[PDB]
Ligand binder design. Structure first.
Ligand code: SF4
Lengths: 122, 137, 208, 82, 99, 148
RNA sequence: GCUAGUUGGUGGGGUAAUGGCCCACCAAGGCGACGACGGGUAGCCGGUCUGAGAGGAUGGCCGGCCACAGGGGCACUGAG
RNA sequence: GAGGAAGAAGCCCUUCGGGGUGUAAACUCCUGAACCCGGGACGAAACCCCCGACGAGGGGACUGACGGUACCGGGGUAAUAGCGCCGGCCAACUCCGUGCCAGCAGCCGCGGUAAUACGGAGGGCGCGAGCGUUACCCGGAUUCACUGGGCGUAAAGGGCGUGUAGGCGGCCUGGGGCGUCCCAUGUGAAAGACCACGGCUCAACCGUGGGGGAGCGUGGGAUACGCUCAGGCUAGACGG
RNA sequence: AUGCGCGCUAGGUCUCUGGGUCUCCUGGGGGCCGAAGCUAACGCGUUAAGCGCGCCGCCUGGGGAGUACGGCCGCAAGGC
């Protein structure tokens, strides 16, 4: 653009839409599990994704992902969520931290144990 | 027409590329000093005031490298680069502590000053700034 | 804190007989002697072509593990070394050779930089009279370092001087066996240093 | 009244003071008016007290009011040795 | 020092007050171009003698009115209505930018 | 001799009846660390053939570069198609600061203190050509002084 | 498009003091695409982080300024 | 900490040969984190009193929460390591379990029977009393391109003229000296940043001093450039 | 699928329209091939997509969608 254009208009600095609206804008945001169910991810993958829909303390009620293998989750489970969307799931843009308020650590876990909220073996 | 100086610059650059012996420009006391600089800086074979149709011109005698062995025999351009800096669109003025070290010294940076047209080597020699015309190498 | 595990394997991992124990550094029981290849299950296997990062990574891991310094303190010194003028490599080196224990080991009072920390960290040395126990201490030029007089009666330090009865010291230093003392003369130069390292690589490792 | 007093710089258990002409009602570490000398209460450094005699002599002349712990040092700096 | 400006009489419909268009050049803070930003000041003409299209010098002063803090330091030039016209054009064009 | 690096080794594939038949291309750089550099780009039906072939082109496509205390007499920027490269001399303590491709190149010229930046397309082949071309344009002070 | 104490003038009241600050009256002015007014957003700054730099984000502690002191209004005393 | 096997055991892999774990260990010597004892502050010299003289100045004494703390001496034990990752990016690889399920994932994508991509083990790698994740800023992003981008076909030339504001503008010569530059100069607080040195046994931290430092005010100078004004020219433009 | 104005940068050729001193040169348009150069390529190339300058418009992944909303215009379709 001509300098006179950049003076008349100037470069339009671009903002970024926050990918995690529900946190808003806290790092973590506790919520209660309402619909603890499964989901089949889109192609190409094929599985039974354990997905829960939780209502946030921020008023929202969104579906988050449940990591690990198996879970004590159910409806009316106090849970802290976080994180980014699982790609292969549709719009499941939050995780469920294993190790917070209902998310018992994945039993028998041995690797990545800080993730998944497991205590070290004796 | 907007800026004769860039024209005389580009008239050089165009003339440089097609390896003209010399070229001409509608003369002007300002340009004449710039041409003096390049000749004084070995950037040209020199110039001379000439008329064409009652309009004074400047036969800028370009200087070229030697003919180069290999695929391209074309001699290496003495003026590898010529680019007006302060433009009619955006003027540019340099303090003493911002007259750039063009090309680590191999290049130059002619720049108008209240003390007249000068090179960046001169300006730091005299510690003066001004409107910065063009970097050259 | 400092590295505390097995130390031979770092040479086997680095593939170079870095000196980390003293005697077994020079024994035929040097781990580089017997098994001059990386440790672990895949050790002997055909070494793959190292990447640029891996090479430069190995460099810093080479140099850093020479001194046992934390990655942080190694990194901290670099910026300080980086902020200073001149060849950042040699400048960054002299600081590394300016550490208290390093000056101690380089002065020959310990058969290993690791052991030298124990002398420092247990207050067995005084810096210009002041009994300093900061292993990360920086010894400036023209400084006097000697065994604590109470540490003078210690036999290990004798054993070290037993070795330095005829062994020499780098040109930036000056030693007295019988006085149990040493003087840091000048900044160790890059040429003076026998570090098996291309620190130029180590520079770029922090240029990323 | 524009006073002369020692503001605490340094850190925990390492007092460093600036004998400084300043308006009274300022906070003791706020914007002073003229740093007219530092002070090592702990005397760790050889020149642990360096104060410009004349400026205090100036500010005193113009209406300064040094606190006792300050005037203890100006006399100790000998600004009053007339 | 009291601030001193030089602009053109662009309005004198107010009693004892004239509107002086002050034009000031300056480089753009980012794009380096020297740009011209004008401005209107309601200098106090106690005599109402400076007339329209008259290049004058106004000066900082104690506040005469809510909108006035300048007096005409002195005349600089008259008959500069051409400048005034360009102003009048500007405010005139504002009618063409409605909806 | 000369020192040599396998900068890039890609496999291209032309389709036809029966399917895709592959060919290996290789960027191979060859220098002495003393100003001499050769950008070999050999391609052939197999890695060792192309690499061996690629270095052969490099040895004939050598170019000596005017080092100065481990750096270059001046910064430079070459537009090679979309690859826009920018190189820049630095103090002796600086080192080489480049992407892997040109860093591999300049580390064989003998350059050891150089500030660079790849702009535009970062195609490693095109990057390399701009680098070898930029080295082909460097000039010492005396050279230009001879020209003028 | 905004603006009728709205712009200005005169006189007056109030003020430590200029001031439409307020008041009475007279005039119709003033503001705006150089973005008025409207909405949203926000304490501001030295600085901090980031960056090659330009620049971008940021203004937690600390230092200076401002506003507030359950939300609003109001004055009294007082140098304040 | 040193020495310490051609290398215990266990475990894991295995080509069954052995290899890795690994001088790692145990083991011997050496020190002494802790801890025990004792001593133990700087920070505190003032205000005050006397003398002087109710001054300069001199003399006297008082006061410490921190804290019996730091710290010092003596004695003194071999005394915590975890976390993440290991397809590529990117550093570090095998076995077993599973078999598009379970699961992982930031992207590429891995998983449908031998998965270096999931879970476990061994190994290894990076950090280390930290190690990761998430949130958000900057960078990378030259991906708002002033530095430092583009528009025939990738996104982008407006349908086109006219022209308003605005932007920009030929030659020469003068004048003003506005931008412009330069000088001096005040300011540009402190703290922060930088530099030098210094004290904290180093560092962090802090102190001191130096430097700066965009910007603005102030006065002076210069006129090349742009600006302004004035006078001329015809190469642009218009006209005949 | 190429905003405008201006300047410079091989040429050959065809074509239309003027002037001349009619081999040819000088001009103004319209095509073709092509130097240098540019271009991701395709191709552009004195009728630039080259080299420059001034000015304006415009782009910031695809779709969602030139849709929603609002506003203006329009009889309406609908347009911006
Ligand atoms: S040399 Fe011998 S002792 Fe020193 S490290 Fe290598 S193996 Fe361990």
């Amino acid at each position: 653009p001509t300098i006179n254009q950049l003076v008349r208009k100037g470069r339009e600095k671009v903002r970024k839409k926050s990918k995690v609206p529900a946190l808003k804008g806290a790092p973590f945001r506790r919520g209660v599990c309402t619909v603890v169910r499964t989901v089949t991810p889109k192609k190409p993958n094929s599985a039974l994704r354990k997905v829960a829909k939780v209502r946030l303390t921020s008023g929202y009620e969104v579906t988050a992902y449940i990591p690990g293998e198996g879970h004590n989750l159910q409806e009316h489970s106090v849970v802290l969520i976080r994180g980014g969307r699982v790609k292969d799931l549709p719009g499941v843009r939050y995780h469920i931290v294993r190790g917070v308020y209902d998310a018992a650590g994945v039993k028998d876990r041995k690797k990545s144990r800080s993730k998944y909220g497991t205590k070290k073996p004796k | 027409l907007t800026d004769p100086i860039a024209d005389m610059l580009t008239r050089i650059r165009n003339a440089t590329r097609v390896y003209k012996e010399s070229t001409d420009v509608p003369a002007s006391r300002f340009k004449e000093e710039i041409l003096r600089i390049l000749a004084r800086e070995g950037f040209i074979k020199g110039y001379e005031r000439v008329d064409v149709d009652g309009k004074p011109y400047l036969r800028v005698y370009l200087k070229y490298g030697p003919r180069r062995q290999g695929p391209d025999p074309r001699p290496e351009q003495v003026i590898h680069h010529i680019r007006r800096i302060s433009k009619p669109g955006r003027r540019v003025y340099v303090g003493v502590k911002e007259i750039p070290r063009v090309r680590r010294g191999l290049g130059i940076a002619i720049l108008s000053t209240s003390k007249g047209v000068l090179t960046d080597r001169e300006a730091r020699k005299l510690g003066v700034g001004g409107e910065l015309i063009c970097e050259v190498w | 804190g400092r590295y505390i595990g097995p130390v031979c394997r770092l040479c086997r991992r680095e593939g170079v007989k870095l000196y980390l124990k003293g005697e077994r550094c020079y024994s035929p029981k040097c781990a580089m002697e017997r098994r001059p290849y990386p440790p672990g299950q895949h050790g002997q296997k055909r070494a793959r072509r190292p990447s640029d990062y891996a090479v430069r990574l190995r460099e810093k891991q080479k140099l850093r593990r020479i001194y046992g310094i934390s990655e942080r303190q190694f990194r901290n010194l670099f910026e300080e070394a980086s902020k200073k003028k001149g060849v950042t490599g040699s400048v960054f080196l002299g600081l590394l050779e300016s550490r208290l224990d390093n000056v101690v080991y380089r002065l020959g009072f310990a058969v290993s930089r690791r052991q030298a920390r124990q002398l420092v960290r247990h207050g067995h040395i005084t810096v210009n009279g002041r009994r300093v126990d900061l292993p990360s201490y920086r010894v400036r030029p023209g400084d006097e370092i000697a065994v604590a007089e109470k540490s003078r009666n210690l036999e290990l330090i004798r054993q070290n001087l037993e070795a330095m009865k005829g062994r020499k010291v780098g040109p930036w230093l000056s030693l007295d066996v019988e006085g149990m003392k040493g003087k840091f003369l000048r900044l160790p130069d890059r040429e003076d240093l026998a570090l098996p390292v291309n620190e130029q690589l180590v520079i770029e490792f922090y240029s990323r | 009244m524009v006073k002369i007093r020692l503001a605490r710089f340094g850190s925990k258990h390492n007092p460093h003071y600036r004998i400084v002409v300043t308006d009274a009602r300022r906070k003791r570490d706020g914007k002073y008016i003229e740093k007219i000398g530092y002070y090592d209460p702990r005397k760790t450094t050889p020149d642990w007290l360096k104060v410009d005699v004349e400026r205090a002599r100036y500010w005193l002349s113009v209406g300064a009011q040094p606190t006792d712990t300050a005037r203890r040092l100006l006399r100790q700096a000998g600004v009053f040795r007339q | 020092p009291k601030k001193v400006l030089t602009g053109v009489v662009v309005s004198d419909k107010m009693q004892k007050t004239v509107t002086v268009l002050v034009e000031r050049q300056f480089p753009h803070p980012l794009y380096g171009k020297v740009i011209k930003r004008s401005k209107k000041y309601l200098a106090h003409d106690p005599e109402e003698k400076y007339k329209l299209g008259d290049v004058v010098e106004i000066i900082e002063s104690r506040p005469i009115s809510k909108r006035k803090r300048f007096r005409v330091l002195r005349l600089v030039e008259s008959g500069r209505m051409d400048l005034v016209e360009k102003y009048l054009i500007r405010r005139q064009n504002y009618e063409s930018l409605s909806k | 001799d000369f020192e040599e690096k396998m900068i890039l080794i890609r496999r291209t594939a032309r389709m036809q009846a029966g399917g895709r038949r592959f060919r290996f291309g290789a960027l191979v750089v060859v220098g002495d660390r003393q100003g001499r550099v050769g950008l070999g780009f050999g391609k052939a039906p197999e890695v060792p053939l192309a690499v061996q072939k690629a270095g052969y082109y490099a040895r004939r496509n050598m170019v000596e570069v005017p080092l100065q205390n481990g750096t270059i007499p001046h910064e430079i920027e070459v537009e090679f198609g979309a690859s826009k490269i920018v190189l820049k001399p630095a103090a002796p303590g600086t080192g080489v600061i480049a992407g892997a491709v040109p860093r591999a190149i300049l580390e064989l010229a003998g350059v050891t203190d150089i500030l660079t930046k790849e702009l535009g397309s970062r195609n490693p082949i095109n990057i390399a050509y701009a680098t070898m071309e930029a080295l082909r344009q460097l000039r010492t002070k005396a050279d230009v002084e001879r020209l003028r």
